[PDB]
Amino acid sequence: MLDAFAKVVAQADARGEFLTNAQFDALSNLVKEGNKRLDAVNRITSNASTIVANAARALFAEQPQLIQPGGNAYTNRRMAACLRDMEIILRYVTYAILAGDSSVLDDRCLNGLRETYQALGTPGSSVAVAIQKMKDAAIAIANDPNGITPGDCSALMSEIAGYFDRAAAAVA
Amino acid sequence: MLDAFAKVVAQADARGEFLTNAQFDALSNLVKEGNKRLDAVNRITSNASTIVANAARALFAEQPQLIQPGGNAYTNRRMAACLRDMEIILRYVTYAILAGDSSVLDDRCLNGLRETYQALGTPGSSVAVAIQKMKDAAIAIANDPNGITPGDCSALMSEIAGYFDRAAAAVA
Amino acid sequence: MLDAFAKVVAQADARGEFLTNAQFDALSNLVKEGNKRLDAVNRITSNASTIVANAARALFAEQPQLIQPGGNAYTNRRMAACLRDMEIILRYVTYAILAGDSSVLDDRCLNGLRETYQALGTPGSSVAVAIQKMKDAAIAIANDPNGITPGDCSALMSEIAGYFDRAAAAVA
Amino acid sequence: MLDAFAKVVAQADARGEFLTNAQFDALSNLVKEGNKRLDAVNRITSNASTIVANAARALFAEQPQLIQPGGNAYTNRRMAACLRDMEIILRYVTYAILAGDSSVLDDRCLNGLRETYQALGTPGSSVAVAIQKMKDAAIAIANDPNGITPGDCSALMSEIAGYFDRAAAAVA
Amino acid sequence: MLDAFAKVVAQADARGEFLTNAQFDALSNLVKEGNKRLDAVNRITSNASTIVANAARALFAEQPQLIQPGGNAYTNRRMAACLRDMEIILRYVTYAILAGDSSVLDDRCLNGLRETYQALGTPGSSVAVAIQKMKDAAIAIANDPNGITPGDCSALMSEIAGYFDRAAAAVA
Amino acid sequence: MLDAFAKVVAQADARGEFLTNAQFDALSNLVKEGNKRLDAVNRITSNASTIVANAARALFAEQPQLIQPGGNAYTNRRMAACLRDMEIILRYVTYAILAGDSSVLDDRCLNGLRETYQALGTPGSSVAVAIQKMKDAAIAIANDPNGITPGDCSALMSEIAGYFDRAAAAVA
Amino acid sequence: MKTPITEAIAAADTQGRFLSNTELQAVDGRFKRAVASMEAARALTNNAQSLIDGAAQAVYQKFPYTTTMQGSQYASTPEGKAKCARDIGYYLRMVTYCLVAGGTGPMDEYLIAGLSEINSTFDLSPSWYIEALKYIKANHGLTGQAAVEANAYIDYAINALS
Amino acid sequence: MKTPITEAIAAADTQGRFLSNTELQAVDGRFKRAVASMEAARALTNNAQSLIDGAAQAVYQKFPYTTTMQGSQYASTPEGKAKCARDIGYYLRMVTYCLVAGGTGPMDEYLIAGLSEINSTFDLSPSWYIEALKYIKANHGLTGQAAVEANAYIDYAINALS
Amino acid sequence: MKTPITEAIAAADTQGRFLSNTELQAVDGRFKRAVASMEAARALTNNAQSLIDGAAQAVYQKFPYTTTMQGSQYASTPEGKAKCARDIGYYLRMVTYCLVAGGTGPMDEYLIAGLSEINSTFDLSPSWYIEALKYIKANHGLTGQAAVEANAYIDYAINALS
Amino acid sequence: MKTPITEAIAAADTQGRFLSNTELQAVDGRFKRAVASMEAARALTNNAQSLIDGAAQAVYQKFPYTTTMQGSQYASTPEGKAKCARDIGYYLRMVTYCLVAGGTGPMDEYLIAGLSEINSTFDLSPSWYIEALKYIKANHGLTGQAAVEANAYIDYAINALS
Amino acid sequence: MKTPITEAIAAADTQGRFLSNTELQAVDGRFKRAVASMEAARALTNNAQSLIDGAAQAVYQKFPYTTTMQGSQYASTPEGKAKCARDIGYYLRMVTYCLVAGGTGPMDEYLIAGLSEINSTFDLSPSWYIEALKYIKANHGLTGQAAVEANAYIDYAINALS
Amino acid sequence: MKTPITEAIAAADTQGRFLSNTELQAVDGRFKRAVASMEAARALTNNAQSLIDGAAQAVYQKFPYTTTMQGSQYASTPEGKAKCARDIGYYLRMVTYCLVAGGTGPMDEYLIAGLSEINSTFDLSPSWYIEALKYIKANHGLTGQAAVEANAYIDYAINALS
Ligand SMILES: CCC1=C(C)/C(=C/C2=NC(=C\c3[nH]c(/C=C4\NC(=O)[C@H](C)[C@H]4CC)c(C)c3CCC(=O)O)/C(CCC(=O)O)=C2C)NC1=O
Ligand code: NA
Incomplete structure (x- = not known):
């Protein structure tokens, strides 16, 4: 996996180039915004x-058809697995928030997950809805103005929303 | 795998339903015919x-082309494997007789077996013939009227024949 | 795997036949040419x-594009792997020289190797060129008239060239 | 492991002897008392x-020193392990009740268990006390005259007490 | 393994006690001296x-008898292993410098190492001498006044010397 | 393991010495007697x-007490194991004949074998007797003057007897 | 699914063997016991509704705070009471399935796997379901070996919750 | 040793579980069958000597070359005949042990393990022992479920030799 | 025990490497944060008794049935109340240990391992301990990064109970 | 297939190495021995029919009951005699293949794998095939190292049947 | 690629856990150090050409035989000198990448993996590259923690070559 | 130690088999080759001193900087020259051991294992030892198959250093 810093490095190496000043500047702002990123992870x-x-x-x-007898979340084994999946997706999304890059999410969580749910008969569009609901709660918690130094985290909330929407698209 | 009893249960759970009286009655007759089933397994x-x-x-x-040089049952390794396969199919058929259901046969023996023989170059239609011959001997042994309390086992012999024909169809 | 002797045996067994005199004669000449084969392996x-x-x-x-930044042999890990592959192909070619048959080369080296390089993005035609260069050096070394009992090794050099061309065709 | 029946067989084979009538009689009474044994297992x-x-x-x-800070059952990991051990000893005792012989208890539970607790610093005499308390509850439950065909189970309760005392002696 | 902080915690938990002010003070000075510790590790x-x-x-x-034919460091395999051991001991000593506690060194390096060398016929006193020489070089490097903010690191050099002497005693 | 040649080499390396002429001469006679050694292995x-x-x-x-009920070779499992052991000892003795050195026998067969039989209750002196009987048959077969170029194999039969007596001593 | 019959087969299959007399005696044991089991299953099925209604009330009686306290985990709304009755019926239905199949299999697969994760996540107390189960046990009205049978599987659930 | 009881335990122990009703039904099955098994075992034990003597002769009748041919593997000496009678008694004794234990265990452990290695090594033909076993089967004189029981274990030996 | 320092070492040791700059930055991160952590740990330690007494009452207020209901799992006796106060102090003490060590290690090892088995066995409701923990969180009186620190480990316990 | 050449390669390949002088000496050993082996193989091939006919009769002489006893496993019909001659020719043909390849490989793969299962299943006695093989050994008419060669592989079959 | 951030994640992911405060402190450590690292990386990048030219000459000065000796591995042709300068620039570029990423990752993946195989194969002496690296270290002109940072990764390369 | 004889045994032992004709031909191959090998080993041993002295000078001639440059890795002191001569004699001695044992075993165990770690650690250039080995190869004065033998093991060392 890559973080935001290693991704710039890998693109640079492919061209055999030292970093430019534009790239150094971009990476410096990444560091200056780091306190906000750590709060978002901590809070979520x-x-x-x-x-x-x-x-x-x-x-x-x-x-409700999900929990009716014969539903894909009926029985405690299937319910457990459903809740587990929600926890996993959330976990991997938080990993990507910390790293500032989706590679860990894409590579270790999302690759092949649509195919997984299709083989099982799990409705992917229901999973997407579950992710969208976690997204809306996560951003409300992360962007809560109470109990923290005031400032603007809107570009970070955009990025966070990006990782959730990516996961919902990956399964639907 | 399922036995005859677990299959009724699993169908019932999918609808979220207690068993009906019709289902209880059907399962009671299954139990009353159990001595016959145990004789059939024991004998085969x-x-x-x-x-x-x-x-x-x-x-x-x-x-005879099977045992001529270049035949698929020529050499002792190939003959051994051929006899082994016949033993295995018989074994799994007897499992299904005991359970009163084909799931164990289908799931653990027959799934993918046609593909297996096609990759090897083993003639599936020859295997089918071997199974049909075991069937005819098995029913003669199981339904022999000597040395046992007289009574009618014809519906059970139908069922037994069913499991053999299923295996022969699966490979041919 | 087969050597030249086991291959004649396996063809014979498929027909259920004792060896003919033609086959015995062919195999005797194989043995009489054995000193030359051992020199070729030793030298290569x-x-x-x-x-x-x-x-x-x-x-x-x-x-040169292979070693430019972004090239498939750029970085020491990729260079190491490239040299390793060349060593492996050479190794397996020498195995086939000793055995007098390509089965070991085909079975354990070449099967699936085109597909391997296509998945990686390694240019197969570049690999072919590397093999052709090893071929030309190997035959020059093996067929060097200095320091050895003089005699004709031309049919063996043909055979050796055969194994290299087979590997180059397998990847290209 | 042995059950009561296999133990008589193994003693007989060592002498190369068919069973006597005394042995057949003893084993018949074992079978006639089998309903009581099944109740005892079911109840415990x-x-x-x-x-x-x-x-x-x-x-x-x-x-109380067991649960004070620094005690061997202080912390949830150590408490869990303690309760687990009690469950295990009980489990293996019930196995021996069913089989009518201690071999399964001795072989798979008790062998080396004193040494295990000595290496850990777990007080064996405290474990013994825990077993003795489970014994007294188990016999009260198993020998409860309510809700069961009346009759004498005293020789079986002696046997059950035997298995508990054996385990308590093994650790102390 | 423990670091200096986890060791105070584990001692406290055994008594079931909150930390005292003396313990908080001791741990604060540990943190205030942390820059020096990081330099020492980095330098060594x-x-x-x-x-x-x-x-x-x-x-x-x-x-010289170590490298004479028949010596314990004669042959490249034995020399490699000897140098490897020196690297390992150094590695584990640096781990203990970072953690401020010997547990990682004792537990994962030194436990059973005397016995190891006795079974092999490796002279433990020669190993001790090798460690003592690494110690003297390590402290000279770590405590070099050139190229660093001046200040007193003498108590840390004492601690570092402590870890080396412990390893030399463990093998001798 | 060592053969006769590698043993001379290993002794030489410990002193850091080239081979003497005495050692070269001894090893040459080993080679000149090689046809006899190959016959002995082939025959046994x-x-x-x-x-x-x-x-x-x-x-x-x-x-006969070995095969009476309760005997250590009573039951087919124990008989099989007994015959197996005899085969194994013979096998490893033939390995040592080929190599001209006992290391393979000592290292891979005899080390710990006395202890093995003591834990089992297998009478070691009975095993010794079995080995002595195989020895006497092996030497009669190997040293049979019929169907072979006449010559003296007495020093080799001494050596062969040496390997058997070593195994019998190892278990007794 | 775990029954005396699939266990007999699993044993043989695991060791690559045909069925033996060892395994046939096991299945006969199951066929003979089936009469007591089916009696139990039938009676529990016929009286299901009263047993569920009685059991839910037993729970509300023992833990009155479940009918008063705010929160979706409790039965202080119509929705909460309906979910509670549903769950209790699930428990009873699983017992009848065990009785019919001659083993724990149905309960093991459909209820017990994942149970502690579910109860932990939705803040459902095991002791609520134990009380419900003890009521069914005291009031099923079965006697002799039919009671032994039904009680064995009810108590199995109780140990799973304990 | 493999019995219905040790199998029931092995199953539970393997999965780290207490015994369930699944396993108790299996053991009850064994207790009920024990009456037929013990009848068979007793009769075979009481009539052991005549069955062994009859069976050996059945073998000599079918394969007369076993009483004439030179070699220690054959019954053409007093010693060979005594070894043959011994082995046949071993077979019969193992059947009575199976009957008593309620499973193949005793035969599996004491006779079948290593069998083909023994017969191969000492040049003993399986078909000799099959004939001996078929004689016992035809002439044990048991009826009903006692015969079913004894025949199950005799036929088990036959398949092991086949 | 899991701290930023033992994690840095475990990483290197697992790959057979010396420590690198990768790992030294991690430990410096811990040393800089220690000032906020120690502030939190000290304040929680000094105010321990009032926080425990307040927290227990918060629990009795929320779940009044815990002070009235018969049973050893409840706080309706002097013994039960003393056990409850003890446990709540254990929770608080573990938080101070985490703060001091700079990681979850102490809580992971001494409290969380085995937790769900303990609560299940003695019939202790997780939601009792969540309420206790929420009280401490609302009333510890810390601000800025000391509050962030203490709240991180309190919320860690809450997720372990959820 | 196992030959001195494929063994030399397998060794190198297993350790990821090029061929060394260690392995080349092994293959030279095989090339030098090939002269004795090919002599043996040629003579056995040219005289195949008389050796098979002689060998079958040796078997019928030793075990006369094989020509009289009813059953498809015996040679008491034309079909049985033809199957017997066939099998004996298979044995001889495998020996010539071993001689040609310089190792046991051909016999190992085409005859010995599965042998004991075949003989057990069709009730074929190993001692029949040993007698056949001993006849070939006594009457092949080879001398010197050609005899050593042919006898090595014949005796290999005998130990496989013993 | 190995950075303080991917290490923090790998740790959590390996144990199936969410990120904890343990791991967040590690990443903060990296963010604070980044100021010293970026200073170092920028200065090394801006002065790259003079450092490469100076370093190559340092090597030619120390090992003059590299400019005179015949062979493609040496710098005695224009091509050889250009390859040498290229390689030295690769080393420097990798150091700047490490500085930017906050760890050894870039050097580990792009240079150190396979290094000893490359140097062995093309007959490149490690001590040439050590000398080049020591020159850069002595003449980069950085002070304080920027020098500490750059020197840590330069010395990392040196130990890889030693 | 790897010889044609221990390889033949290892093969058999690995597959649990007696030695076969497959393996005996391999060992005969070794016995026949031993005459050429022993000739080579004897000549190299008798002429050892001149070959070592000549070889060291060949190295000093090719790489003159090894006799001038300061450092313990070089031969610019009496001690350094004596260590160089020692090492070259080690190489030659290992070749004679290979010749005697009929395989790479002695060199594999005593020299090649650990080689690249040693050369890397003490800053010893492989190309020094290649030059030494090429001198011995050009000047050993052996002809025919004795030269083939000695050259095979010398070239084996060269590939190990390349
Ligand atoms: C599925 C497993 C299984 C069980 C559980 C089982 C129990 C069982 N125990 C029985 C009887 C009995 N059970 C007991 C046992 C006791 N009575 C007492 O007063 C003692 C306190 C107590 C000590 C255990 C007695 C005395 C009998 C009657 C005698 C007998 O039939 O053995 C009977 C016979 C029918 C009856 O009397 O109701 C059965 C079916 N059978 C099975 O197949
Ligand atoms: Na037992």
């Missing part, structure tokens, strides 16, 4: 259980 | 070696 | 490092 | 959780 | 090869 | 089954 991680449970509750309220 | 199993050897003898008598 | 093997290094030098001189 | 097993939890509660009430 | 690590090679050179100069 | 190996079976027959004739 610190509320991981409620994000999952509350999103799952909402999903089953809107799609 | 107790004669396993002669069933195999006698069927193989017959097969090679009718299809 | 004894110069294995220079064959590889000198062929690689030549390849990178003619195809 | 059906109450497995309360036997363990209630014995552990009692142990920690009488030996 | 950055010169790892010369420390080893120069110590080994010296050892073989003073104990 | 070619009669391996009768050596074992005939020795075992004799052993059980002289020590």
